[PDB]
Write an enzyme that holds these catalytic residues in place. Structure first.
Site, PDB file in Angstrom:
ATOM      1  N   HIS A 174       0.816  -1.216   0.000  1.00  0.00           N
ATOM      2  CA  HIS A 174       0.000   0.000   0.000  1.00  0.00           C
ATOM      3  C   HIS A 174       0.861   1.284   0.000  1.00  0.00           C
ATOM      4  CE1 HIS A 174      -3.713   2.169   0.230  1.00  0.00           C
ATOM      5  NE2 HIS A 174      -3.416   2.741   1.400  1.00  0.00           N
ATOM      6  N   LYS A 226       1.794  12.438   0.629  1.00  0.00           N
ATOM      7  CA  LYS A 226       1.689  12.442  -0.841  1.00  0.00           C
ATOM      8  C   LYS A 226       2.613  13.474  -1.501  1.00  0.00           C
ATOM      9  CE  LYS A 226      -2.826  10.408  -1.392  1.00  0.00           C
ATOM     10  NZ  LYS A 226      -2.346   9.486  -2.457  1.00  0.00           N
ATOM     11  N   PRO A 245     -14.315  18.289   9.725  1.00  0.00           N
ATOM     12  CA  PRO A 245     -15.322  17.227   9.506  1.00  0.00           C
ATOM     13  C   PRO A 245     -15.645  17.163   8.009  1.00  0.00           C
ATOM     14  CG  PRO A 245     -16.295  19.077  10.694  1.00  0.00           C
ATOM     15  CD  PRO A 245     -14.824  19.349  10.620  1.00  0.00           C
ATOM     16  N   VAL A 264     -15.418  19.335   2.255  1.00  0.00           N
ATOM     17  CA  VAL A 264     -15.908  19.434   0.866  1.00  0.00           C
ATOM     18  C   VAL A 264     -16.368  20.860   0.558  1.00  0.00           C
ATOM     19  CG1 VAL A 264     -17.450  18.507  -0.956  1.00  0.00           C
ATOM     20  CG2 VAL A 264     -16.537  16.965   0.820  1.00  0.00           C
ATOM     21  N   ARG A 268     -15.587  23.825   2.044  1.00  0.00           N
ATOM     22  CA  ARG A 268     -14.531  24.841   1.999  1.00  0.00           C
ATOM     23  C   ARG A 268     -13.667  24.824   0.721  1.00  0.00           C
ATOM     24  NH1 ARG A 268     -10.579  23.191   7.140  1.00  0.00           N
ATOM     25  NH2 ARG A 268      -9.789  21.261   6.210  1.00  0.00           N
ATOM     26  N   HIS A 303      -7.523  10.888  -4.443  1.00  0.00           N
ATOM     27  CA  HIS A 303      -8.461   9.965  -5.093  1.00  0.00           C
ATOM     28  C   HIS A 303      -9.844  10.387  -4.626  1.00  0.00           C
ATOM     29  CE1 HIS A 303      -4.979   6.843  -5.484  1.00  0.00           C
ATOM     30  NE2 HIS A 303      -4.798   7.888  -6.297  1.00  0.00           N
ATOM     31  N   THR A 304     -10.191  10.066  -3.369  1.00  0.00           N
ATOM     32  CA  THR A 304     -11.434  10.553  -2.773  1.00  0.00           C
ATOM     33  C   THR A 304     -11.340  12.089  -2.741  1.00  0.00           C
ATOM     34  OG1 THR A 304     -11.546   8.597  -1.338  1.00  0.00           O
ATOM     35  CG2 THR A 304     -12.801  10.533  -0.617  1.00  0.00           C
TER      36      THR A 304
HETATM   37  O1  LIG Z   1     -10.102  18.139   6.051  1.00  0.00           O
HETATM   38  C1  LIG Z   1     -10.389  17.055   5.606  1.00  0.00           C
HETATM   39  C2  LIG Z   1      -9.564  16.443   4.658  1.00  0.00           C
HETATM   40  C3  LIG Z   1      -9.943  15.211   4.191  1.00  0.00           C
HETATM   41  N1  LIG Z   1     -11.143  14.610   4.636  1.00  0.00           N
HETATM   42  C4  LIG Z   1     -11.441  13.250   4.163  1.00  0.00           C
HETATM   43  O2  LIG Z   1     -10.299  12.428   4.567  1.00  0.00           O
HETATM   44  C5  LIG Z   1     -10.299  11.257   3.751  1.00  0.00           C
HETATM   45  C6  LIG Z   1      -8.839  10.965   3.309  1.00  0.00           C
HETATM   46  O3  LIG Z   1      -8.880   9.619   2.895  1.00  0.00           O
HETATM   47  P1  LIG Z   1      -7.652   9.227   1.953  1.00  0.00           P
HETATM   48  O4  LIG Z   1      -6.268   9.777   2.426  1.00  0.00           O
HETATM   49  O5  LIG Z   1      -7.712   7.794   1.761  1.00  0.00           O
HETATM   50  O6  LIG Z   1      -8.070  10.094   0.590  1.00  0.00           O
HETATM   51  P2  LIG Z   1      -7.612   9.665  -0.860  1.00  0.00           P
HETATM   52  O7  LIG Z   1      -6.121   9.167  -0.888  1.00  0.00           O
HETATM   53  O8  LIG Z   1      -8.554   8.581  -1.516  1.00  0.00           O
HETATM   54  O9  LIG Z   1      -7.733  10.958  -1.509  1.00  0.00           O
HETATM   55  C7  LIG Z   1     -11.340  11.486   2.590  1.00  0.00           C
HETATM   56  O10 LIG Z   1     -12.592  10.751   2.933  1.00  0.00           O
HETATM   57  C8  LIG Z   1     -11.539  13.061   2.639  1.00  0.00           C
HETATM   58  O11 LIG Z   1     -12.879  13.426   2.250  1.00  0.00           O
HETATM   59  C9  LIG Z   1     -11.929  15.208   5.551  1.00  0.00           C
HETATM   60  O12 LIG Z   1     -13.000  14.711   5.965  1.00  0.00           O
HETATM   61  N2  LIG Z   1     -11.536  16.377   6.044  1.00  0.00           N
END
Ligand SMILES: O=c1ccn([C@@H]2O[C@H](COP(=O)(O)OP(=O)(O)O)[C@@H](O)[C@H]2O)c(=O)[nH]1
Ligand SMILES: O=c1ccn([C@@H]2O[C@H](COP(=O)(O)OP(=O)(O)O)[C@@H](O)[C@H]2O)c(=O)[nH]1
EC number: 2.4.1.255
Lengths: 695, 14, 695, 14
Positions: free
Chosen positions: C184, C509, C564, C569, C571, C587-588
């Protein structure tokens, strides 16, 4: 500049006690100048103190952004997160505070408290020492470090440490500052009774200060039992209705109350943990109210008052999950301290302390702010007869007669013994003995191989070390075991040919004088071992070093891991004698050891906590086990370990008396508690303020 | 206990 | 001596693979000599590997008592407790191991892993460095330390660190040892595609090894849809049915499946967390099976097979809570990797990887062990249209026109605007603008004062920073907010007169090349800031130091705390442009930013994880945001921050296309997934082994 | 998030 003056005014109104006017003024300062780090930090502290944690968090986030070098705001934000149960978040904040300012003593101390609360004592000790290196005069860090050192039995410069703790408490009480020694820890140090009571009083005063801001008037209390149909409404308030020692002692009491004269209300301060202890109290109380769903102390006290409670019972005192603010609001006319807290509340809002003549003699009434309310035998109670009925009887396997080398217990033990051909009955009830034949060999083979269980004549024979694998609810005491269990000295590495002195309490209860007393006993009894627990394991090397310094080889002390509830009580049958800690006795632990039929030697002190074991023994009817001084404690323990006929007589007395005496009789206890409640009520109803209920 | 939990009487936060 | 030979035989049979004969022989060694520390320690390791943790714990307790200097047994017991989720217990064991042997490198590394998993990275780093000081050649500690350093953006000797990681992986693969770099994490380092696939394959092989001991025969699979009434039985296996990004992406999919042709079975690997995400999937799937209540992988795979699953979907891969042993048992004829894991499983038991032409071009098929199964646009999906419908439209407040300075969103926003007298409609749908009057002043006053909410013309106007205080379920995305929310640049300390480039991913990242690219952009656009998250806060001082070294003052980078879900989302609407991480894309996070209507600049790499953002943008229809090299990435980002008319055009395109394109269309996505499933089925039904489904 | 939790995709234990 106008924002500066507005922040100054808010600070003035804050010192006066007008918290609402302070909030309004801090907001006005922010309205004028929004990027004001100090106004955000002050408003956040004010909101945190009001219990408005989420709102406080918004303002701390503003302060940290505006001033990135504001280590104080990171540390204070960490304190808010800790209170919100965000442990990782709090640690992140203290970590950032230390990175911003490595010389910030408070942040190191707050980081040490996270390591402490997470059980990592060596890291807690390291961070408190950094705090004290940075700020030598730091009462919070010094006292918290002293408690870490107590937990691990680190007695380096102990006498000087004890003198400094007393000196710190004396200065804080004199300067009207909240003492750094917690009241629940005050019995561990040689503080005066006056100092221990004053520390408690300061904690009680914090609750009053927190409720005075609600501006609630005094409640109108019932003056008779007419609206309750002649029944006395008793409210039990506890954060421990679930898997906790409190429920292991009193879970049967609510259901044993007489419904014709009493109406029982249980006020839970904790959410439902899914255990049978919580199930039982919810099913058996006449009313069960979940106050964990009512965070406001004003609304929760209104709820208690609405129920019409005559006697409100404080089962927490200064322990985890307490909401003493409920008692500070006085929703009931009579408020009593009971069972959970081994000391005075020091608070004017508590009327009585439920105790007994042995624990709290009339002479020492001065140690308590409350009036004494005596139970006739001991105020102590345990649910052992209900939780562990499989330990009411036992059988042994003669591997060569010993009552504590290879032991069997079970609900179906009689039926199992009846299926065996050559069982001998040794008159004490009586003790059945199985000889060293085929069935006895199969049992020892199971233990040696680490096998979980075997079958003999269709009966389930379980290895006592494997209870969590057989029935996890039986291991925790939530269910009575349904198999026959084998307990042996070989399961714990205990010698088959020696006297076993035990102590199953947390190691913090031991001090240098106690270990020296124990070393003196071991030296006088050649064929003997001291059996202790890794409680915590990090205390083991310290005890072993001090024992070695006292002239005891490593093999005189045997350590076992902390065990699930049922195994802990059951394995007490393997010891010959329990050596009680005089500093602070075993309380629940004393009841556990006596249920196994193990004589306990005690030396009662002056504090409530140092006298519980002698009260339990007096109720049991074993006066000969109570020592007046250290020499008598050693002499009693040595007589028990050397005069084998005397040991047999005493173990027989404990074995019989745990049943025939009032000690574990929950019905008798509830009935005596009811008699005491009616005495408190009739006294109040006649228009009298509380007075000692000592006859 | 190791592999589970042993609840004990403990001080409230201050 | 006979016990010594018996322990040797058990060790031989253990190496052969005969675990049951090894157990029987270790028990026989204990039968002969019960106080055998090595036999107890070996039997415990064997039981731990079998997943018999409670039984392993009994034997570790024996070893530690018998040999008190056995640091190895304490360390191994700590590993068993960690697997049992007893974090405090594990820490106690590693602490004791280090006290017994301060030179024990493994115990320091295991202690570092507890600090790492508990989020305390600086303490994890300190303990890994001690491990490496003690044992310089320690692949587990070096690779785990490299990941800690990645999390906090510590890039000291980065290039040499990356070369050493590649060298460690190369040596481990060559010597047939499990690589120390987790699959991973493999996309974060410059490993070859061959190495990344081989690491994955070794993890897949661990699952096969764990299932081969069950000695289960291959399952008889369905050859038609007759027993399922012409319906394809699809089984979704996930530990993330609850509050987790996986459910935030796909929670609507099970309920959108066509019941005439599909029968949906959701296999939960986690217990019910009480959230609406778990409620939705349980209510909408045709069948919901809680496999967290079935710990045996044999019994759980039997359950899947009994249900008659045609296509089993792996939503975990090598992520927390995975049970890839279920897939290794092959209970279904077709097994596909989908959405949760951004890489190859490298395992022969996985038939397909659900991807797309943009993410995984046919040319790079070699990077995957699975056959490619293409979705027509992107394999990526998000539940944003269902979770955040209040963000479909927005209104702004003109405080001097800007679309991202002061923003309003709400289900009832239209009704609120209709109650206002001087609202202007700016044609893009369209953007309503409220002028700087009485209502606009009341809104800014609320934000500046930190007020939670206000009322305007009977409408609820909420401060966007206070969502947890208004409705906690709306803050987490479990419920749609029922009030009108205000989002402003002033809530985050963002400049009102500058370009905001954002990146809301975890800091791991980012790498030196990425921060340099971002610094180059900021230097070219004078009126600009980079907006990042304290993810974790301990990474903030490292980013700020490297930015300062690159010639950027502290004020060019703005940090916000992690928020939260809904606030995070929402902001995103405040930014002008999102700068995607080329090492491993959002990704998300990419779906989150695009739902806010924020253009995202990306540079797709070669790995699946580095190409997701370009796949999302291609689906969206924004090809101009995809960079072929670093210079083009900087040029696109600089054009967006300087050509304001171009920025308006692109933001307008993203705003419209998140609705009109297939990107957030869950119904269309489910229908395309169904088309892909039938293609996989018809291929298998015709008697063919898996092949690329690329048209 | 501080004062709550933000679940993320993370590696399984090895
Ligand atoms: O201030 C923040 C920043 C990120 N997220 C959430 O934190 C998670 C991060 O998960 P992951 O690192 O796996 O995201 P990915 O690599 O898929 O982008 C996601 O559900 C974002 O929506 C959040 O709720 N608040
Ligand atoms: O090996 C052990 C030792 C103790 N206990 C329990 O641990 C608790 C200790 O609580 P506390 O320290 O408050 O005991 P007390 O001071 O009242 O004796 C009691 O419920 C004991 O029965 C246990 O389950 N296993």
């Amino acid at each position: 500049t106008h924002a500066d003056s507005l922040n100054n005014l808010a600070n003035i109104k804050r010192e006066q006690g007008n918290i609402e006017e302070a909030v309004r003024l801090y907001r006005k300062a922010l309205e004028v100048f929004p990027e004001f780090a100090a106004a955000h930090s002050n408003l956040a502290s004010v909101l945190q103190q009001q219990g408005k944690l989420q709102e406080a968090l918004m303002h701390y986030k503003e302060a940290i952004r505006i001033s990135p070098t504001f280590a104080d705001a990171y540390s204070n934000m960490g304190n808010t997160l800790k209170e919100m149960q965000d442990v990782q978040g709090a640690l992140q904040c203290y970590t950032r505070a230390i990175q911003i300012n490595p010389a910030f003593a408070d942040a190191h101390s707050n980081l040490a408290s996270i390591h402490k609360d997470s059980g990592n004592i060596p890291e807690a000790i390291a961070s408190y020492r950094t705090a004290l290196k940075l700020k030598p005069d730091f009462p919070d860090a010094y006292c918290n470090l002293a408690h870490c050192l107590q937990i691990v039995c680190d007695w380096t410069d102990y006498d000087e440490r004890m003198k400094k703790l007393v000196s710190i408490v004396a200065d804080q009480l004199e300067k009207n500052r909240l003492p750094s020694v917690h009241p629940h820890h005050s019995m561990l140090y040689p503080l005066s009774h006056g100092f221990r009571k004053a520390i408690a009083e300061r904690h009680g005063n914090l609750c009053l200060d927190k409720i005075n801001v609600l501006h609630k008037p005094p409640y109108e209390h019932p003056k008779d039992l007419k609206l309750s149909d002649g029944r006395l409404r008793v409210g039990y308030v506890s954060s421990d209705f679930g898997n906790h020692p409190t429920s292991h002692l009193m879970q049967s009491i609510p259901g044993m109350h007489n419904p014709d004269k009493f109406e029982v209300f249980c006020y839970a301060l904790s959410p439902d943990d899914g255990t049978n202890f919580r199930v039982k109290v919810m099913a058996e109380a006449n009313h069960f109210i979940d106050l964990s769903q009512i965070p406001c102390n004003g609304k929760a006290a209104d709820r208690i008052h609405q129920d019409g409670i005559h006697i409100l019972v404080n089962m927490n005192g200064y322990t985890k999950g307490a909401r003493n603010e409920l008692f500070a609001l006085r929703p009931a006319p009579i408020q009593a301290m009971w069972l959970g807290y081994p000391g005075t509340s020091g608070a004017l809002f508590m009327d009585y302390i439920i105790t007994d003549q042995e624990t709290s003699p009339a002479e020492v009434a001065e140690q308590y702010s409350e009036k004494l309310a005596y139970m006739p035998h001991t105020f102590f109670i345990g649910d052992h007869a209900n939780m562990f009925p499989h330990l009411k009887k036992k059988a042994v396997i003669d591997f060569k007669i010993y009552d504590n080398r290879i032991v069997l217990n079970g609900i179906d033990l009689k039926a199992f013994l009846d299926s065996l051909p050559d069982v001998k009955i040794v008159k004490m009830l009586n003790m059945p003995v199985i000889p060293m034949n085929t069935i006895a060999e199969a049992v020892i083979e199971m233990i040696n191989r680490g096998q979980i269980q075997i079958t003999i004549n269709g009966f389930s024979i379980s290895n006592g070390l494997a209870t969590t694998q057989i029935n996890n609810k039986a291991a925790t005491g939530e269910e009575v075991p349904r198999t026959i269990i084998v307990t042996t000295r070989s399961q714990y590495g205990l010698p088959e040919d020696a006297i076993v002195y035990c102590n199953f309490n947390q190691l913090y209860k031991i001090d240098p004088s106690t270990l020296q007393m124990w070393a003196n006993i071991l030296k006088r009894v050649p064929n003997s071992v001291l059996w202790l627990l890794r409680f915590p394991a990090v205390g083991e090397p310290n005890i072993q070093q001090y024992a070695q310094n006292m002239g005891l080889p490593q093999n005189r002390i045997i350590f076992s891991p902390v065990a699930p509830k049922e195994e802990h009580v059951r394995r007490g049958q393997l010891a010959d004698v329990c050596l009680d800690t005089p500093l602070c006795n075993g309380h629940t632990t004393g009841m556990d050891v006596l249920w196994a039929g193990t004589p306990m030697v005690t030396m009662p002190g002056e504090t409530l906590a140092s006298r519980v074991a002698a009260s339990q023994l007096t109720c049991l009817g074993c006066l000969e086990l109570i020592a007046k001084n250290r020499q008598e404690y050693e002499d009693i323990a040595v007589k028990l370990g050397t005069d084998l006929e005397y040991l047999k007589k005493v173990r027989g007395k404990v074995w019989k008396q745990r049943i025939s005496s009032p000690l574990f009789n929950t019905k008798q206890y509830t009935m005596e508690l009811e008699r005491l409640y009616l005495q408190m009520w009739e006294h109040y109803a006649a228009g009298n303020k509380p007075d000692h209920m000592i006859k | 206990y190791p592999g589970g939990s042993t609840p004990v009487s403990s001080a409230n936060m201050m």
